[PDB]
Amino acid sequence: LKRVVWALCFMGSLALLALVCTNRIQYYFLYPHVTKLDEVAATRLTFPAVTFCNLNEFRFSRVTKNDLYHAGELLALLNNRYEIPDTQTADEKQLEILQDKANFRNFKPKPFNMLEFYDRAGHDIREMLLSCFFRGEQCSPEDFKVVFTRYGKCYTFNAGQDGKPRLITMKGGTGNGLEIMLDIQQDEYLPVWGETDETSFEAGIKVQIHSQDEPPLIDQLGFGVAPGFQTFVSCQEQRLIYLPPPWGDCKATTGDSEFYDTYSITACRIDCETRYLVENCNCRMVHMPGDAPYCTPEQYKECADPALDFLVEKDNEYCVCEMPCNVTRYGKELSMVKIPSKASAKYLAKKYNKSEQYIGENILVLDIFFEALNYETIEQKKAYEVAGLLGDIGGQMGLFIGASILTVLELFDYAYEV
Amino acid sequence: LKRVVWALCFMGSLALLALVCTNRIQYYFLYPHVTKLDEVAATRLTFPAVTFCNLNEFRFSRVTKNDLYHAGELLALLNNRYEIPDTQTADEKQLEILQDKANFRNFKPKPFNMLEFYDRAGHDIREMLLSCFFRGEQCSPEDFKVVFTRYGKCYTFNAGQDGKPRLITMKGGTGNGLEIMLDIQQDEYLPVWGETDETSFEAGIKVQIHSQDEPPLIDQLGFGVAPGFQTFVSCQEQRLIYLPPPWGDCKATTGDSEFYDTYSITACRIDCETRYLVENCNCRMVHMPGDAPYCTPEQYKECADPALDFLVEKDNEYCVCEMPCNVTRYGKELSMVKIPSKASAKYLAKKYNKSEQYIGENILVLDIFFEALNYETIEQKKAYEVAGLLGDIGGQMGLFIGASILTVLELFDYAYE
Amino acid sequence: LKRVVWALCFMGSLALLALVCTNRIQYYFLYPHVTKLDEVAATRLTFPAVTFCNLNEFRFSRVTKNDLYHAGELLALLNNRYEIPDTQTADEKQLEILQDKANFRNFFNMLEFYDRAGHDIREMLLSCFFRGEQCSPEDFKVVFTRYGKCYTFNAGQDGKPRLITMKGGTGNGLEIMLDIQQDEYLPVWGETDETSFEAGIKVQIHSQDEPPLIDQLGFGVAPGFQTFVSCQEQRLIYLPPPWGDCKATTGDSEFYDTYSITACRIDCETRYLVENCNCRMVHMPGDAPYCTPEQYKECADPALDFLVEKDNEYCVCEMPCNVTRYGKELSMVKIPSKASAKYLAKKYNKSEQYIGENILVLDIFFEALNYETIEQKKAYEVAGLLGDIGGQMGLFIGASILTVLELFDYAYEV
Ligand SMILES: *[C@@H]1O[C@H](CO)[C@@H](O[C@@H]2O[C@H](CO)[C@@H](O)[C@H](O)[C@H]2NC(C)=O)[C@H](O)[C@H]1NC(C)=O
Ligand SMILES: *[C@@H]1O[C@H](CO)[C@@H](O)[C@H](O)[C@H]1NC(C)=O
Ligand SMILES: *[C@@H]1O[C@H](CO)[C@@H](O)[C@H](O)[C@H]1NC(C)=O
Ligand SMILES: *[C@@H]1O[C@H](CO)[C@@H](O)[C@H](O)[C@H]1NC(C)=O
Ligand SMILES: *[C@@H]1O[C@H](CO)[C@@H](O)[C@H](O)[C@H]1NC(C)=O
């Protein structure tokens, strides 16, 4: 009778060992991870890269007759027949100027390049930048690097490219960061006389705070800043460490692109777009990097734009961009105050030779800074390693039947002898 | 002497095994969890449901003499004695309209319904919606579905109700989302001539971005949008998975509500309120769902409001809403640009046959989109499961005394003799 | 041949046990932790303390001739030679007043000057409501910061009970209508260090256990808008060494009852200024002597700036293990509505323009009646290590602690 109770106890114990062991094994092959959040104080923080664009792509006073000829349809200033659209709400002077530039009688077309057009007709930072301050000391427009995006000629402060060393901040708070007073030059905006898809009613700038290791993607990752306010941006540096397969989904390999030195998801997207447009239309857009020839406005109309839209719509499988394992993100909180005060309106108007109306509707102040001298870390950590797996299997294997790998080897010994 | 040192080693080993084993047991019985954060790229994102209200509950030009008679005191247009309050700083015409509407001389009242009054007097989406675009293609006011909230007649885009399929976005950024130009119609706002508790000075709209599975709760979960700016709202889809008892506190059961098909904490809140008001006052407010009769303004005055206030403090234990285990939340970052530009102000003024002053104080553009085509996941994960407990107990049990469950069974066997 | 493969299996098995066991040993000695996020529903939430300053340090109408004499250079209204700045863009009345106050023919405490000349909450506070019930200016406690005379609602200091809210949403919180008094702003005729073009207020939402640090931790609120602030209470629990970096011993400073990272920062600053200049600035607390405007120019400011740059290691403030933080999301609506501008203008005896350029409404509340908890939790405890080493020790060679002791015996005998 005792051998029966022993047989039942050994059988049930071996069954429990079976299901528990297969449980821990399956849990290991899920490759599970859990997250470790930490806050690290630092004596210094590397200030990020700040890219800003004017919402107006190009200045009206800088557009020329040749520009209307080649890119008149693309710039939406002229209709398909090289004639001005509906004149509703058209200033007499502006409409006469445009009508004069669109005469096109005995006109010899000069050579035209999209990057030349954006570079000269775009808003000059030397005119927009009314004042610059970093850590309380003056900055020059030479700190701003020209970057071409979908919005046109844009500028990146502290880009850290072309061998310039990146700036640091040793104190947090509103004073100890970037602080620029900009004039968005609303007088230079393209007149809107007729409704169009490209017609926009916004006035202000668009800013993206990003690491120097990634290029700007201002059309998607930027936030707007409106004239007439001083906007504060409190930043919190975040350092992210992800896990590669089979734990998570990250880009383990450096994967350097021909266009960009360091791999980033932004660089992967704009690289994918660049390759697609170069293959499909044999030309490259203004914002894209490389050595390819830039598109002509005819190529823009008949190939480039429908090609990108078709790439977005047809299938995401062509452009699948994984996230790198080491990522520096910047968190940001926005707040506003009014500019200028009644005590300063006259002084600003006289300082920049403008009317107080103009100052009120054209001046914005951007204040970008770190809230405090610390950074957060978010790390994906492996939850079950092979040492822990063997430890649990050994513990339960020793608890239920008290056997070992040598014991199973001995049972296989008798099986081979049998 | 050797058996004595052996006895000391076995005793100390058995004590240590005792305290370590009870340690792992107690840690298991705390039922602990830890969190798994992950970010997932996606080729498509389901666009959320967007509900907005005008801050002005009902239009002044649509209020009628009968409305003043029944709900004049409730709307704060008339005083306790059904008379207009002080006319201080009242436009002559503006007051003339109200004085004529509140005559009540030889007036034979007609039936009155609160939901009819809000549905007819509230701001019409056909007049507010100056332009609508979703993913660059035009939308109609018919895309917005009417929901009645505490703020009055409100509208939900991509509500996904009545069999409509939920919309998706295949690109991120400002262009590729919902983008509406609204006229908040500040001329239709209730005149404020005298101080009252209900008096408010704000002008604009209130928006809540929420999953289609939940009803809006704009009085608590909404954010404001001011006229004269294009407000960008960058959304981040977050997918949350919680643990039921005994690990955490989540809804293990489906939790069928009578009013709503899907369970949500909001649906639980307005369910608690609706049930409480039906039991105490036998009527429901406009925002509440169901089939009960709507309250009359007298019922609102003498029963509903004090009942809700008594519900907040006295019965704070009475309404307990557990959180569901699988929840889709949307995070948001707001930024603004100025509207309109000087190059467009007059074109807007002529396009909508308004003065530039009006455009300046009445037009707002709302741009709701996903920052990028990805979603975050926040999961509560069990930290100590029974397999790990048995493995650790077996490991320490085998390290300290080298025993097994069969060893203790044999010890009970020898003890049996 | 069988004993040879048995011996090799025991050798290799002991090697595997060695590397796995040392693996768990080293992993345990990393002292790792992982994060636990949780959301806790509550019937009540303790409302935070809200400190706000006007961006304008002191009122122009309250400055007197003596104040111009002593602190004229510091306040930037007068130059080093006690003369008026450039007369470009100067109000005729303001310039006549300043020249008259600067007559300096036949003609001071910093805290008296800030306390009396600063913006009075009794004039700024046009309306106050908390949970729908009226509040008085006496509920705000005066705190002196770098911005000047500032005010803290629900400060909870001096034994006052902390306020609670039993409902979430815009109505059920603090709601104040303020007049920033833009007419009292210092006239700016020439460039100066204090010169600012902003108009509005600065707010910091913080727990009562920590002092305000509004020049660094504040956000702006612009006039002409009602800004809503949705708050989410967060409770953070950190680990002390060797797991993390937290202050296990509170080691509260004499200046403040409860230890906070901010309180440690301003304590270090006060101590440094007392050591180098034998005086304390306006914002600093204690019983120490306040600086004179001459002391400010030649000692205080360069000492503070040099303290930030020269020795950043000197002030090391550890983070406490239990920290209550408040998350916040801002949004705006326009104030006043066209239907309400006239009533406000007449109610407060101002022009409709003045209301447009001076009135702001602040609405601070909890989004919902819950709070988040973020806890650092130990990933490998000594019981788990002994369990893993025991499991692998029993799987690979099947030995025990008693087995190793017996091996020491048999080795000792032979
Ligand atoms: C990602 O960041 C980690 C640190 O956060 C890097 O790990 C360091 O790698 C260097 C080798 O170049 C070592 O000298 C350091 O000791 C490592 N630090 C730690 C904490 O392990 C890692 O190399 C980075 N990965 C990439 C691809 O850049
Ligand atoms: C200010 O600008 C106007 C615009 O052309 C110009 O005529 C005037 O001379 C300028 N004044 C000064 C002082 O430069
Ligand atoms: C435009 O509005 C005015 C009143 O403001 C009205 O008289 C006129 O008929 C309107 N025109 C159109 C085309 O609606
Ligand atoms: C810290 O806060 C937690 C709740 O978040 C509480 O349980 C604990 O008692 C507090 N004190 C310590 C020393 O952890
Ligand atoms: C109202 O404002 C005027 C203009 O400054 C002032 O003279 C008058 O005294 C004010 N009324 C009161 C009651 O303060």
Ligand SMILES: [Ba+2]
């Ligand atoms: Ba009752």
Ligand SMILES: [Cl-]
């Ligand atoms: Cl997992």
Ligand SMILES: [Cl-]
């Ligand atoms: Cl727990």
Ligand SMILES: [Cl-]
């Ligand atoms: Cl670790």
